[PDB]
Design a binder for this molecule. Sequence first.
Ligand SMILES: *[C@@H]1O[C@H](CO)[C@@H](O)[C@H](O)[C@H]1NC(C)=O
Ligand SMILES: *[C@@H]1O[C@H](CO)[C@@H](O)[C@H](O)[C@H]1NC(C)=O
Ligand SMILES: *[C@@H]1O[C@H](CO)[C@@H](O)[C@H](O)[C@H]1NC(C)=O
Ligand SMILES: OC[C@H]1O[C@H](O)[C@@H](O)[C@@H](O)[C@@H]1O
Ligand SMILES: *[C@H]1O[C@H](CO)[C@@H](O)[C@H](O)[C@@H]1O
Ligand SMILES: *[C@H]1O[C@H](CO)[C@@H](O)[C@H](O)[C@@H]1O
Ligand SMILES: *[C@H]1O[C@H](CO)[C@@H](O)[C@H](O)[C@@H]1O
Ligand SMILES: *[C@H]1O[C@H](CO)[C@@H](O)[C@H](O)[C@@H]1O
Ligand SMILES: [Cu+2]
Length: 230
Amino acid sequence: HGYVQNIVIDGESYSGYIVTQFPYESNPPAVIGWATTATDLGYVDPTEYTNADIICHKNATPGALSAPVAAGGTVELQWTTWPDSHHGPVISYLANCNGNCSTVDKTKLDFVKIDASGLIDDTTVPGTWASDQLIAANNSWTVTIPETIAPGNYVLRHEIIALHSAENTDGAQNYPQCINLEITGSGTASPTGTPGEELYTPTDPGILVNIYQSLSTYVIPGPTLWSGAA
Ligand SMILES: *[C@@H]1O[C@H](CO)[C@@H](O)[C@H](O)[C@H]1NC(C)=O
Ligand SMILES: *[C@@H]1O[C@H](CO)[C@@H](O)[C@H](O)[C@H]1NC(C)=O
Ligand SMILES: *[C@@H]1O[C@H](CO)[C@@H](O)[C@H](O)[C@H]1NC(C)=O
Ligand SMILES: OC[C@H]1O[C@H](O)[C@@H](O)[C@@H](O)[C@@H]1O
Ligand SMILES: *[C@H]1O[C@H](CO)[C@@H](O)[C@H](O)[C@@H]1O
Ligand SMILES: *[C@H]1O[C@H](CO)[C@@H](O)[C@H](O)[C@@H]1O
Ligand SMILES: *[C@H]1O[C@H](CO)[C@@H](O)[C@H](O)[C@@H]1O
Ligand SMILES: *[C@H]1O[C@H](CO)[C@@H](O)[C@H](O)[C@@H]1O
Ligand SMILES: [Cu+2]
């Protein structure tokens, strides 16, 4: 359980959607993070992989703000304290809004995988994962905006999938978090994305998986990493 509470881009800081506070305010601030009803700080499970909740988490609505970032620059996402038990991959996607992201129809976002890390080392079961690297780096993850991606208004969908109960059908726990970015630069690529409701299935090898054994490989779920990615 947890959420993205802060975002840093080239020395400027942007509050996340503080789901522990904003849902209970009459006038919460405008932020680049999407609002969600995931008030218990929980997850989306595989029974919702074809439903709108998997896109940007439960009942999510776009943030009213966007953060500028140069193509080729970095975006740092700062999570709340992530529990070590929640081992799994850390996956990040960009989707062009082709318009103002704050009024986008989230079912029309086609997500391009631009960053993904999975099982790092399994010499001691259940292994060291991207989520453990995230914990060690001050509970944060940094992604690079591909330098060739065309400028525009994009959603960054940043996600931890916790696998500690994924040995059972519908056991995986997806924690997606969306923020709005205004990407600048001289990129010209418009890679093909995947609709959020088509990213994952409940039987994917990285989704239905028993991490309490030595794994020789872990297939990170979702579409292929885009060749333009860092
Ligand atoms: C989430 O959206 C559904 C579908 O419109 C709605 O029925 C439900 O009440 C919402 N849940 C909230 C706002 O907590
Ligand atoms: C994008 O839409 C939001 C929500 O209506 C609005 O507040 C904001 O001003 C818009 N951004 C621009 C650059 O027009
Ligand atoms: C570590 O994370 C906290 C909150 O998650 C943040 O306030 C702090 O600036 C971060 N430190 C660095 C060096 O990024
Ligand atoms: O449009 C998708 C396409 O965009 C990139 O710029 C190319 O390098 C290809 O490797 C990739 O498949
Ligand atoms: C490691 O070993 C497993 C069998 O457990 C294979 O499925 C995998 O391809 C790799 O060789
Ligand atoms: C667990 O054992 C497997 C072989 O099945 C190795 O691939 C892995 O590195 C770990 O030693
Ligand atoms: C082991 O093999 C799988 C493919 O079966 C890869 O996806 C993984 O990254 C590792 O190389
Ligand atoms: C990942 O890579 C494959 C080809 O390697 C593409 O077909 C796909 O669209 C994604 O960019
Ligand atoms: Cu949890």
